[PDB]
Swiss-Prot record:
CDD domains: Menin (cd14456). This is Menin. Component of the MLL-HCF complex, at least composed of KMT2A/MLL1, MEN1, ASH2L, RBBP5, DPY30, WDR5, HCFC1 and HCFC2. Component of the menin-associated histone methyltransferase complex, at least composed of KMT2B/MLL4, MEN1, ASH2L, RBBP5, DPY30 and WDR5. Interacts with POLR2B. Interacts with POLR2A phosphorylated at 'Ser-5', but not with the unphosphorylated, nor 'Ser-2' phosphorylated POLR2A forms. Interacts with FANCD2 and DBF4. Interacts with JUND (via MBM motif); inhibits the interaction of JUND with MAPK10 and the phosphorylation of JUND by MAP kinases MAPK8 and MAPK10. Residues 210-381 are annotated as: Interaction with FANCD2. Ubiquitous.
Length: 481
C-alpha cells in the first residue's frame, strides 16, 4: 500500500513536486506503478481532457504560478484524492483475485494466474468507446471512466500484478504492440490486449507465432522486456500533452521533458530507443540549457537499437528522419528513410503490420514527392543536383522491395509505381548516371556514389533506373510484379 516515504511528498502543488515523487519512487527497490500512473493521469485530466476549473467540487483546488507571457493554474494533487483512487484499484484487484487458489512455486506466477489478472482488468472495461481516444492510457482513466487503449490494458495488467504481489510479471513491448513476460527466467510470454481494429482473440496465447512469422509487430524476437524502471519510462512516454489536434499543454510537455531527463540520468533510457527520440523531439521545441542537442539524442536512440536490439527497430531512424524533414535537410532525411527501409528489408509484411505499411506508403508517395517538388521550386533562382540523394532514394525502394520478398500479401501496387517514376524524373540523367550500381567485385579485404541492391526487383531494373530517358512502363511493370 501507500507508505509514509510516499505520502509526505503530497500535496503535489507544482510540476517539480511531481518530478520529486517520481525521483523518490525511482530510488525505491520496487517503484509503485499504480500511484505514479494515477498521479500522471490526474494532472493530465485537468491540463488536457477538461481544462474548465470546477465549481461544485470543494476538496479539489488549483495552484496559481506565473506563466511565461500572466498566471498558470495547476491541479493540486491532494493525498486525499490520490489515496482514495489508489485504495479503489487495490480493493477491486484484491477482491477479484484469490491467490490462495493459485500455488506460487517459489516466487513464480503461473499462466493461469496471469490470465486471471488479465481477465479481471479486461472485464472491468466499458462495452463501447473509441479505441484511438487520447488520454485513456493511465490508471486514473481505468478507475474514473473505465477506458484503456491497447497498450494501456497491458500496463494495467502489470500494475495489477505488482498490487497482488506478483514481481516476475513484466511489460513486454514492440514498436506498435504490448504484452506480458513472466516465469522463472522471464521467458514465458502471454497476450493481454488486442491489436488493431478487428482481429481474433489471441489474448492468453504465446507470442511465438508472430516471432517466427518475421513480422515487424514482434520484432523477430528483439523486443523490449521492461524492468520496473523501464515500465516507469513507458508511462512517462505515454503522457499526452494534446488539448486538441492543433494545441498542446505547455505543463504536460515540460513535465514529460523533466521526467525523461530524470529517467535518462539514472540510465533507465539506455535500453529504450523511442524515449530518446521523444526526448530529442521535445528538446527541439524547448531546449534545456546544459544538455545534449536533439541530433545527439536522436543518434543515442539509434545506438541503443544497434547495441541492445540487433539494429531491428524502425522508429529511431524515423525520429531522426522527421527532424531533418522539419528543417528541409533533404539528403539527411532521405538518408534516414533509406536506413529505415534497410531495417524493414529483413522482415516480411503481414496483415497486422498495417501501422508501418501506412508509414512507408506516406513517405514514398506523399512526403518524398513533396520534398522533391519543393526542391524543384528552389532550383529556379541543390539536393536534386546531389547524386547521393538519388542513391538514398534508390536504397529506400530496395528496402521496400526486399520487404515484399517472402511476404504473403503484396506491398508494392500501381499507386506506388507512379511516384517512383515521378521521383526518378526529379533527378536529371547526368545526376542519375553519377551513381554506380555495383554488385561487388572481390569479397573481403586481404592483409561517384556506389550502391548495392539487396532485392530481385531493383536488380532487374538497374539499367532502366540509370537511363537518360525513363521507360515508365518498364519501371512500373517491374516494380509491380
Ligand atoms: C516532413 C515529414 C515529417 O516530418 N514526418 C513524416 C515523418 S516519418 O518519418 O514518416 C515519421 C516519423 C516519426 C514517427 N513517429 C511515430 C512515433 C513512434 N511511437 C511508436 C510507439 C507509440 C506507442 C503508441 N501508440 C506504442 C504502442 C504499443 C507499444 C509500444 F511500444 C509503443 C505509445 C504507447 C504509449 C507510449 C508509447 N510511446 C513510446 O513508446 O514512446 C514515445 C508511440 C509513437 C515516431 C512516424 C513517422 C515525420 C515534414 N514536413 C511536412 C515539414
Amino acid at each position: 500500500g501507500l507508505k509514509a516515504a510516499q505520502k509526505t511528498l503530497f500535496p503535489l502543488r507544482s510540476i517539480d513536486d511531481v518530478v520529486r515523487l517520481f525521483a523518490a519512487e525511482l530510488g525505491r527497490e520496487e517503484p509503485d506503478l499504480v500511484l505514479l500512473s494515477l498521479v500522471l493521469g490526474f494532472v493530465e485530466h485537468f491540463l488536457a481532457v477538461n481544462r474548465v476549473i470546477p465549481t461544485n467540487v470543494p476538496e479539489l483546488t488549483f495552484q496559481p504560478s506565473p506563466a511565461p507571457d500572466g498566471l498558470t493554474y495547476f491541479p493540486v494533487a491532494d493525498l486525499s484524492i490520490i489515496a482514495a483512487l489508489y485504495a479503489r484499484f487495490t480493493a477491486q484487484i484484491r477482491g477479484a483475485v484469490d491467490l490462495s487458489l493459485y500455488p506460487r512455486e517459489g516466487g513464480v506466477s503461473s499462466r493461469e494466474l496471469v490470465k486471471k489478472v488479465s481477465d479481471v482488468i479486461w472485464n472491468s472495461l466499458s462495452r463501447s468507446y473509441f479505441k484511438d481516444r487520447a488520454h485513456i492510457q493511465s490508471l486514473f482513466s481505468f478507475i474514473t471512466g473505465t477506458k484503456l487503449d491497447s497498450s494501456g490494458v497491458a500496463f494495467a495488467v502489470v500494475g495489477a500484478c505488482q498490487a497482488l504481489g506478483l514481481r516476475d510479471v513484466h511489460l513486454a513491448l514492440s514498436e506498435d504492440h504490448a504484452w506480458v513476460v513472466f516465469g522463472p527466467n522471464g521467458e514465458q510470454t502471454a497476450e493481454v490486449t488486442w491489436h488493431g481494429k478487428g482481429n481474433e482473440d489471441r489474448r492468453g496465447q504465446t507470442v511465438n507465432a508472430g516471432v517466427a512469422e518475421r513480422s515487424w509487430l514482434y520484432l523477430k524476437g528483439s523486443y523490449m522486456r521492461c524492468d520496473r524502471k523501464m515500465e516507469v519510462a513507458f508511462m512517462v512516454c505515454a503522457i499526452n500533452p494534446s488539448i486538441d489536434l492543433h494545441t498542446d499543454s505547455l505543463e504536460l510537455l515540460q513535465l514529460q521533458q523533466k521526467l525523461l531527463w530524470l529517467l535518462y540520468d539514472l540510465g533507465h533510457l539506455e535500453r529504450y530507443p523511442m524515449a530518446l527520440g521523444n526526448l530529442a523531439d521535445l528538446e527541439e521545441l524547448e531546449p534545456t540549457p546544459g544538455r545534449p542537442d536533439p541530433l545527439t539524442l536522436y543518434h543515442k536512440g539509434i545506438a541503443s537499437a544497434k547495441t541492445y536490439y540487433r539494429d531491428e527497430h524502425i522508429y529511431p531512424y524515423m525520429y531522426l528522419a522527421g527532424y531533418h524533414c522539419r528543417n528541409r535537410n533533404v539528403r539527411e532525411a532521405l538518408q534516414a528513410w533509406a536506413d529505415t527501409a534497410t531495417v524493414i528489408q529483413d522482415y516480411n509484411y503481414c496483415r497486422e503490420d498495417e501501422e508501418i505499411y501506412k508509414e512507408f506508403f506516406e513517405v514514398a508517395n506523399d512526403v518524398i514527392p513533396n520534398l522533391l517538388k519543393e526542391a524543384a521550386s528552389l532550383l529556379e533562382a541543390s539536393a536534386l543536383q546531389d547524386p547521393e540523394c538519388f542513391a538514398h532514394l534508390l536504397r529506400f525502394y530496395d528496402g521496400i522491395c526486399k520487404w515484399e520478398e517472402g511476404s504473403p500479401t503484396p506491398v508494392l501496387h500501381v499507386g506506388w509505381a507512379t511516384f517512383l517514376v515521378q521521383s526518378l524524373g526529379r533527378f536529371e540523367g547526368q545526376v542519375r548516371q553519377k551513381v554506380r550500381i555495383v554488385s561487388g567485385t572481390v569479397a573481403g579485404t586481404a592483409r561517384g556514389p556506389v550502391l548495392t541492391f539487396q532485392s530481385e526487383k531493383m536488380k532487374g531494373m538497374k539499367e532502366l533506373l540509370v537511363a537518360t530517358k525513363i521507360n515508365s512502363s518498364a519501371i512500373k511493370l517491374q516494380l509491380t510484379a
